[PDB]
Design a protein around this ligand. Sequence first.
Ligand SMILES: [Mn+2]
Ligand SMILES: [Mn+2]
Ligand SMILES: [Mn+2]
Ligand SMILES: [Mn+2]
Ligand SMILES: [Zn+2]
Length: 835
Amino acid sequence: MVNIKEKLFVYLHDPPDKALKIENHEERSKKILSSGNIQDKVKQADALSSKTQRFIIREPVIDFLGRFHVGYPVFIHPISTEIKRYETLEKYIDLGRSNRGERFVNEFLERVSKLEGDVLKEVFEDASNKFKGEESKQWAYIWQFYPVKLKEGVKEFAKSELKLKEEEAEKFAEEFVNLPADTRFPDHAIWTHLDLTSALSVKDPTLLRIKIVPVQPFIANSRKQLDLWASSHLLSMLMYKALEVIVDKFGPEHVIYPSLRDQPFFLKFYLGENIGDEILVANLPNKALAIVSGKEAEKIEEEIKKRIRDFLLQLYREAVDWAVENGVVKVDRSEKDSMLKEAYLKIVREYFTVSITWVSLSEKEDIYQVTENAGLSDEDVKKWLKFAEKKENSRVLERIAIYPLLVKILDSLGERKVTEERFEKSEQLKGWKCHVCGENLAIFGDMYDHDNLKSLWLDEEPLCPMCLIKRYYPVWIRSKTGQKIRFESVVDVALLYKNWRKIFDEKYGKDLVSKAREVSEDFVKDNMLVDSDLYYSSTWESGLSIDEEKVKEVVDFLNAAYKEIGNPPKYYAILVMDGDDMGKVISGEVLGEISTRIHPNIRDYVEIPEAKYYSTPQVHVAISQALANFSIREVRSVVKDEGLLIYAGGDDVLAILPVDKALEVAYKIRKEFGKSFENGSLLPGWKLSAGILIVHYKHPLYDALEKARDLLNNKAKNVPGKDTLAIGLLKRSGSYYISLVGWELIRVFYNSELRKKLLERFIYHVLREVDTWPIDEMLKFEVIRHIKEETKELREKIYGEIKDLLEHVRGNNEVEKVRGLFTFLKIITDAEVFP
Ligand SMILES: [Mn+2]
Ligand SMILES: [Mn+2]
Ligand SMILES: [Mn+2]
Ligand SMILES: [Mn+2]
Ligand SMILES: [Zn+2]
């Protein structure tokens, strides 16, 4: 139901360069739109936005080209409260004003508006050319690529017409595109404001919350890395199928969370853009927030559920066909027909529960009634409401004025629904269970004895419908995107340690392949080993799936290689990260004081309640965009091809890394999640906790994921103030070493001379002594004990370093701190884990 002209008008009610001049900005919007159409609903949208405002200006103006003017405008990070100044823009504007004054102002404005109009026209043309039939895809394309093409055009304008250097031009454009929407409260960029106006320009706008469950039972129950990735990615695809409805009916700017801008799924499967291996990463969470017209709410709920069910069923059908064709199931046409029986289709149908809930944004009601019935009543909240009541002179208001609490409310309701629908879930047939998961009925399981059931399946491994879908999914992604993950096995990731696989392939690869051929022709496929574990001599020594004792020759060959280039890495690392109190960040209760959000100069001219800063919807959109930038760009940039980044949607991250790269990667992802700005774009100015679990490759994956999630949720997030890294080493021995450590310790230790000496006895004795010991003296004794002019310096320096490191260790008393620090030291200094 998308009409592109009206959408362009209501969207560009304000110009992108509103920050540049506040005076007569509607006129510039009229010029930009003049290329398209002629410049209502926007009034209602503006009023609804105005209801969220928590200020009364006591009239001051902040503007680059203004004439009472209170100075140039800056940008303030919503979470960080860090101030970002438009340096290049400021300089150029100042020099221009100095040289030609007002004439320069009008001429420059006319030029800039001419450029924005041009770019808008070109983009519109591209949209109409690429998507002739469908207006929805057109608007999606325009909304997506407009700020980009604008950035390129402004960069060209600065480089050519203004004769600026490459760096200065890039800065000029990046600062131009990321201008604020309200110079008084530069929490958010102009684009998020445009998005909100367009979203709220619809009749009876309502807030829609979507949740798809279960995440963990589906994901964490994986036996293979490929199955894990498949699970995460399939979940993300389900969320994309859900959001596709919203994008179709309304547009991408209607989705508050997650932000759809630069989303690989949105770009590839909707805008048809050609995408690389970045599509392999799962960037969409299982929770979503959108703005939808009130009349069409239920219809859209049914439509989302319908699309998800249908997609899953088609996926299952294609899966069945694939399985029958490639020999995954050795079956005849009658049985193939039986594979699609109502029971299995029903399993597929009812596995995923989708809870959609909504609340009208513009239906007036008592603020206090809403919050009290909700139970969201703090001392701060009461003041926050009182200010609104006094400002609007009305006790009852549109509930959008209580937007943050509303979201909370919605979440609550959603949660309950999740339970209810789960209670009314039909029991599953009684039968033999899937060999992969062990919780779902296997196909043919109800109809056959276990032996016969085993005979029907490849490698004697019966599959449930969901696991069959899960097995077919990588082929499906390969067909739809031309992409497959670089590392299929967990051993693939483990062997990245010190480039062991590359070095070994280069030196002894062909010989290992040939001797493998000597043992059997099954082990070698496409001149490569069919499985990576065949790189280990142990696999050949014992368990295999007889043959001549030539296998032993291979083994000795491998052992010889191990003598020459070192032993192969049998350990890998699971990195699971999550943001600290993210919900409280979004609601804004943790974020702190409201005063910091205002431009410093107008602090006196504006009246503000003595209460917490609860997030306006534009702030929510801003933060969503920040999380999208982080997950889509930064995390993937850090991991690169050093490992496998399975999932990255907003705050939470899931990746499999080699043991050497794990700590660096985790620390750098945390560092980048710390940054407030990268170029023009925003980043989360916040903190996250993580869990790193080092596991032997033979260990069952589901248990490893369990212990990793355990490390993150029960260890790292249970520390006051959080922001901790929980490192666990689970040796084949069965011994489990856990160390709780602050992020800085990684950097300090990497810088420490202690590391240099350690890499090029002590730790064991320290752990032995701590338990019985009654401490700085106790430490000093041992440091002196294990470590001629040089030695006093080295003892003093390493004791100093240990003293520094102990500070960053998560322990409540020094006994704890030493135990943790030296547990960490035990973890790194393991000859088995770090050859
Ligand atoms: Mn406006
Ligand atoms: Mn306006
Ligand atoms: Mn999270
Ligand atoms: Mn970066
Ligand atoms: Zn299964």
